[PDB]
Design a protein around this ligand. Sequence first.
Ligand code: HEM
Ligand code: HEM
Ligand code: HEM
Lengths: 32, 32, 37, 37, 166, 166, 215, 215, 31, 31, 29, 29, 289, 289, 160, 160
Amino acid sequence: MSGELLNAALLSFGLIFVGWALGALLLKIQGA
Amino acid sequence: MSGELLNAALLSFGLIFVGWALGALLLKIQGA
Amino acid sequence: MVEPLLSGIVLGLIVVTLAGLFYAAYKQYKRPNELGG
Amino acid sequence: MVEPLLSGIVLGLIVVTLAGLFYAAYKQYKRPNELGG
Amino acid sequence: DVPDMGRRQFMNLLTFGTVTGVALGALYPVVNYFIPPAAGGAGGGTTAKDELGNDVSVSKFLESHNVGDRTLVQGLKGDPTYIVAITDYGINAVCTHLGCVVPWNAAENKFKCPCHGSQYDATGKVVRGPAPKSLALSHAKTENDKIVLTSWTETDFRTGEEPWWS
Amino acid sequence: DVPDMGRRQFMNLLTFGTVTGVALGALYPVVNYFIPPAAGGAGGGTTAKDELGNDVSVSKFLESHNVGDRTLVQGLKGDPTYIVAITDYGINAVCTHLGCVVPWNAAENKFKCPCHGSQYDATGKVVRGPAPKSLALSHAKTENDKIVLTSWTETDFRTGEEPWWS
Amino acid sequence: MANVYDWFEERLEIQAIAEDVTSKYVPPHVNIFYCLGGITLVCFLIQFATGFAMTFYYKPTVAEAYSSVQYIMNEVNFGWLIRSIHRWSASMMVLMMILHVFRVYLTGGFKKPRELTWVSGVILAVITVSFGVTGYSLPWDQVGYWAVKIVSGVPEAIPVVGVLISDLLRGGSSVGQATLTRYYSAHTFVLPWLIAVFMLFHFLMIRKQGISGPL
Amino acid sequence: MANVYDWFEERLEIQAIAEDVTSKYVPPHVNIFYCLGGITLVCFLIQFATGFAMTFYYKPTVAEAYSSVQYIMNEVNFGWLIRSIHRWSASMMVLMMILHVFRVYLTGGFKKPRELTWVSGVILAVITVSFGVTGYSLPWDQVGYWAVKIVSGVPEAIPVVGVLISDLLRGGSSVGQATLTRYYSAHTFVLPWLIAVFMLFHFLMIRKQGISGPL
Amino acid sequence: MLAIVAYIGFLALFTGIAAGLLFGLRSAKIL
Amino acid sequence: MLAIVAYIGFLALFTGIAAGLLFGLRSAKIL
Amino acid sequence: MAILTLGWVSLLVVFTWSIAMVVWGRNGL
Amino acid sequence: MAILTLGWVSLLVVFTWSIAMVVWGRNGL
Amino acid sequence: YPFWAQQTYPETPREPTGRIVCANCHLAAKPTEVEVPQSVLPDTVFKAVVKIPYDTSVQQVGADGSKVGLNVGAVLMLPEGFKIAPEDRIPEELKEEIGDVYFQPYGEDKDNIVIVGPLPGEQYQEIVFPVLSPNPANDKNIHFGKYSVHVGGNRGRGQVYPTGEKSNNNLYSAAATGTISKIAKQEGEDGSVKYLVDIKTESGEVVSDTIPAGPELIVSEGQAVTAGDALTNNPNVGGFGQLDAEIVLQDANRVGWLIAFVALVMLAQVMLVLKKKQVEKVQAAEMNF
Amino acid sequence: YPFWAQQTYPETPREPTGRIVCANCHLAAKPTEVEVPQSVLPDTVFKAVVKIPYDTSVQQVGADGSKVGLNVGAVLMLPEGFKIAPEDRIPEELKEEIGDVYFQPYGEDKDNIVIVGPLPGEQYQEIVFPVLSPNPANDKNIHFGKYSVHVGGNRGRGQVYPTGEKSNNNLYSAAATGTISKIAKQEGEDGSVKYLVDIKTESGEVVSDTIPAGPELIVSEGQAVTAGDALTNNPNVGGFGQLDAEIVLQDANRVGWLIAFVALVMLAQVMLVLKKKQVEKVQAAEMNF
Amino acid sequence: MATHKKPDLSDPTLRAKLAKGMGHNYYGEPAWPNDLLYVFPIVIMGSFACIVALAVLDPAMTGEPANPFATPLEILPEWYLYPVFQILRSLPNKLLGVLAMASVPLGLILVPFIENVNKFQNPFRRPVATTVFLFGTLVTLWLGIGAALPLDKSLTLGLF
Amino acid sequence: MATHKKPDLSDPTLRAKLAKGMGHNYYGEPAWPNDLLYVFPIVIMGSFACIVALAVLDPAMTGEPANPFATPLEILPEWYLYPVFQILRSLPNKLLGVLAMASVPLGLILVPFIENVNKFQNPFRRPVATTVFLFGTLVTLWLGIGAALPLDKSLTLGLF
Ligand code: HEM
Ligand code: HEM
Ligand code: HEM
């Protein structure tokens, strides 16, 4: 039980950038 | 148990005037 | 349960207070304070 | 008890956040906002 | 060129409507959480307990709990219920006026509420006092060595027409 | 003609001093109220209870509670205490490091703390592990059919010099 | 020291608070009866204190309630004092509040600018009474238990929501552990938060609008 | 209707509040990390709500604690939800607060005008952690019970007041009913009042001084 | 009786201390 | 796998609805 | 049993004295 | 057991979407 | 009689409802009073008075038929540790007040539950109890505090014997429905006056009842009366009454410290008032308020 | 052997501390692992894997003296209602994975406590359990939620028999203090290799110990060694290991409503962002902010 | 003598207040040291001392363990619930009782909206109100005493 | 684009604020509708939803009844108490442990009084502080992980 820890770590770190990028995307497609 | 009730009634009514009078007194003796 | 000392204090103080309230209300009716009303 | 999912979320979020804080601090070092400092 | 008041209020209705949805969804489980869990409502009710919340045994009850018996037993809804050669109905002891336990008097053949002085039958019909309706009735059937109680569906055998608690 | 700063501060000290008195008087009982009531401290302690907080009987203990016995008993201050043909001392089982109950191993002739691995004697002296001092000792004298426990006043028979918990 | 006060003054802005406080005045028509509301507050503060104290020993459980109260009276240092004060001050609070209401009413102080202060006050009175009802039965003695058992029935009368309201207030079809639990939550958690919010309003309005005028 | 709003406006003075609210502005340097404190508050509000909810069924007694928790999980409608939310949100609150501290510190926002806001925040952190410690052992399971039993010993080390502090925190010479009682009072009465006072300060200062400047 | 006497006496004594303290403190020019 | 697909899909669908709703509401001249 | 009477007396004295002190301190009513 | 996976997916989606929505709504960061 | 209470109801004279078992047989209700002090110090003898008044010149029906006076009796339930004072701790004044009273306890060790059997109702309209308060200082389950006192007082003859049969001091109804035939007044060899009854009418039943004379008759002759028609009068002129009171087992040290604290409060109040006066003088001089 | 656990410790293989009784005889510690799913739907067959790895090319001491391979065994403690899946509910893939495994319950009705006796350690480094989750819908004391799973895995021979005597798979010390005389290596008629010992020195004692050959010797000849000197070597190459895990007995309806609520949240979030955008346009036009 | 500040009737901000019913914290004796610091403690300590005195001289009773099978004789709530309790045990219609009960706070909530017909504060200047108040007060005290007595002698207090 | 109000640098009241470290709510995007009404709900609902999601997918465990005679193997507090717990189980001197524990909040209370030596906010502009912070952070995480492992392999994390 430490492959699951690092799984949660990686994801909660990485999903932010996906959210960020996806936020950035929506801003471009609106004409900021 | 209603002679005691009326005793408490009479006293809590009457002790106010004693307090009032005694307050009034102290005011006279100070020179208001 | 009916507590005679308590009930006495209740009845006692309700009466003196109601009395002094009317007294105080009167004092200012017969001699209005500045801005009285 | 050591909860792997929780601990992961803790370690994960502590790192991204510390990272983004320094990133944000940098962004304003290389290009100051009005009244910057 | 720029959205007018009509179109802003329409965005308000659309937007805050959806937000209200989320709120209501969140509020649904909460309202329900406070409503007490069901009293294991599978049958019509189950077993009668004594003064300690154990269980009455019909073998030990008829052996030793009053000659010309009328003894208080925890019945349906926790309620103290009288059990009267075991009788096929229980008499709920909560006097219909305000809810005092009604002690039995064998001498006068009546239950009398000591709270404000209302009286009932050997069955439980009101004869006087401020108490409006009559004492509630249940089914009392023996299964195993224990007394099982269920709620009285059918009409009152003392009023004639359908019960007030039915 | 009019009281100066010196005389106002002196009235302040006199007046608010007395007020502070009232406050302290009111605060006295309150502080004390929070300090837990004394653990019936008449003797040096009283009776030992089993796992349910009842009472141990020396007749039923020696009858049936381990051959080459070492059994956990609620002792002084609620503390789980080992009782080892009944032995005249109890061994407090709270390992001196951080307070885990120390299980007994008959195979190695030692108590071993499973928390961070500290060990003790058949008496209770530390041989290793992070635990600083040795396990506490009490008096275990039989009165009636029950075990009475009192606190160890005199010097340790295993250190030589006066106890740490004395 | 190095001026500790000027440190606090500079960021807390004490001086403005001091200026604001010493800018207020009490008019001649304000007599001793204008103390009654403040006395009501004192009684409640005494409740808050002694009530808190009692939560360190009281146990809201049918097995333990009664005897913890016994424990407080007989064994806890000054337990008897703490509890008797809480008992008496409970009664004084309700008395003084009535006296307060008398003064408010026979002084016309509930009018035009001030009716929300009166409305909040009525809510305060219902809250206070609820404290009383709930606390009264916490000892789980014969008196308190039989006081719950009568009132818990009352809401049944209401046509559609009556049994639900009753079940909510008592935690099921009849009085028992759930009732004590809910009452304990009410008395020590819900009602202290509710009274704090409505007192907070009550006082904010008073402070905003000042006392009412001379009669 | 007859203008209900103008009624409230005239005595509540809504307009001034509205003017005050809409007179505030958020500067460009304020990013997403300036949400962390507010998120901490959200977590606590979730604690307040679900915690309150649980006091309607939880019983702070060694005979009843564990099984009331069982009762909440198995029998109470959405009990499992309420409790799991309280469990997770307890953890999230502490996490977000740490993240908040990071943002405060790596943003220099604790300086000259604002050190009482930082000091109050540290107190808030100790309070929050105390909530955690206390709540953790309320189920009176093996985990929570053995977590109390270790920490309750710690204060003994302190030279003169150590045993007293320990006895005060645990309600006697060892963990037992008194400990659960005190912990329950702590978790559901003392700590919610203390956190409310220090959050009230924390926020009042923030509102007084506004956010700190750009970095 | 003892009640009445003790009441009058307690109040007399404290009115005493009130007055005494008034003039006493006036004398030392504190009031 | 299903995880990855479902994730991308859920976000795609909602980015869809975000965009769709943007232009859709612009079209009716609400935005 | 004299102490029992002095006990009640002291209640009646604070009550009276409390009024007196208010009246005195704030000049009437 | 597909529902068990979609369950965890939805957690990861709100988390991501919550960030997205903040970034979008308040123009960055 | 108080001793019949303890015979039928051995455990306690008080039922879980607070009803005193006495009322199970003394079926009418007259007023009963108590005088106890509001508070008592520990290890102190004090007086509890139980008042059982009735009209002294009205008379009751005796066992046979006679018209005799009535007797008083009472149970006094005191708190734990309380008990009747030893004779050598009762002062003289009190001794003279007590009279010829045989305090018994309700049972072994039930020393705070005090029975007082039949006393002539003309010297004992009020019964004086000398009671000794216990002492927390040297008995670990007696604690200072406020406790209930229950009192049960009766005057006049009862209505039910321990055996369950009625006495001659109540009403008598009719057995069944129908016209009464003969009200004959026969007698045995032992007891004196008795009175027969008969009913009947329509197909079935010829039953009869006998009434122990002493009450009275109010029946004419021959009436179609149902089941339970009052054919007697009620002779009872007595009755039983219950009260509750409270007593404070008080501690002198508590009260001492109270007086001390009250004094501190009053001093502090003077101080504050005088301090205001100083400020009033300062404000008059330097106009800056 | 797992069956010796249930012999000596019939009630449960888990002591109140969470220590698995297995460790009372398997005295060395090697790592044990478990794979369970994080969640399972009710009435579903899923796989629990228990991993008992050891160096396959290292060998152990057999009962006699030999150098043989080792066996794996495990106890699996599941939550209530959980149990080994019926054979007709296990898919094929899973069947092939399980091998020749004789799941037994620890005792009658203890169906969630699953023993798995000796298996050749070279095909069963990991043991696959087919388990069937229970169902709250039709069993009233099974409820959705998160529950512990305890796991105990062993490889290699133990150290103590049920009878209490040591095996040939451990260390051997010296009896008393003093110089060892002869290390003779006699034998009986039945068992093969044995080894004697002797001590003595100073006034008193001539005692001797015999060691069951299999371990090794590391002693020279004649040394003044005290009580408990290691005169053996440790032959043990196996060990026992414990773990805990958690499983969520999950409800699909819970998760369905979650997905629904999550979707509502995201929609609402879009709405709010779009609403802000509308206001941003209004503010640009009418400068009044 | 005393300390006094007269209303500055030249300040338009005070005037605007007075006009609205509220400028009354602007004049009188200084609220600070005078009242808040010097006399408030007096009132606080005094009320605290009365309460403590009553608590010592007349401590709380603990009853007897609750018993679900035995109803006491005498079964009252606390005094301030007497009038409401009276109403509640003497009306045959239960619903009617709940409503009369509910009508105490709801009725009182309406008082300022009913008496806003004028701006009088003085009771001598509003005899209709003073009468109605006195009437309710007296009816309350009547129903309060009524609750301590048997039902049959309550709606008359056992005097006629 | 966005909505923006620039600092009115002509208003002496704003200037006096800025000088004192605080005029920063006076300019930017409007706090009201924009932030408080439109995005705050987003953050509220979002964090609420994450929590609820975790609560459903990974509900609370209930343990086993407490047992005063049997200590678990593994006996941790919650994660945020790991670093403090680590310190507390590895220092032999108990008093020293209590003090190091007490020093976390007391040390943190002193941070603003120590770093008031300058008015810098940016971490890149204060490398001594950023270093010390990073050092403590890393030592914390170190002691945190340390607590989950056996004592003997903790002060090294079992890697050297
Ligand atoms: C001499 C006795 C008292 C009198 C004559 C009195 C009178 C007043 C007056 C005139 C106000 C309105 C203040 C204003 O016009 O701005 C007020 C409010 C208030 N009083 Fe009293 N009071 C007395 C005692 C007390 C006491 C003992 C307390 C205890 C804390 C107290 C607490 C309060 C509170 C919380 C308010 C709320 C309004 C505000 O803060 O301005 N009062 N009182
Ligand atoms: C402690 C409670 C009781 C008290 C204080 C009490 C009191 C008295 C007193 C004072 C008398 C004599 C009155 C007179 O002759 O003028 C009396 C007689 C009588 N009592 Fe009681 N009693 C009690 C219990 C009982 C009980 C339990 C019963 C029924 C079993 C009972 C039945 C009677 C009867 C039938 C008489 C009339 C005796 C006769 O003259 O034939 N009493 N009682
Ligand atoms: C559920 C818990 C247990 C498990 C999983 C377990 C596992 C095993 C396994 C897999 C073996 C065979 C290894 C091999 O020969 O290569 C074995 C042998 C052995 N076990 Fe256990 N066991 C358990 C309980 C016990 C207990 C309670 C005892 C002592 C009473 C014990 C004593 C032994 C001994 C002495 C051997 C060696 C037998 C021989 O070769 O002479 N085991 N055990």
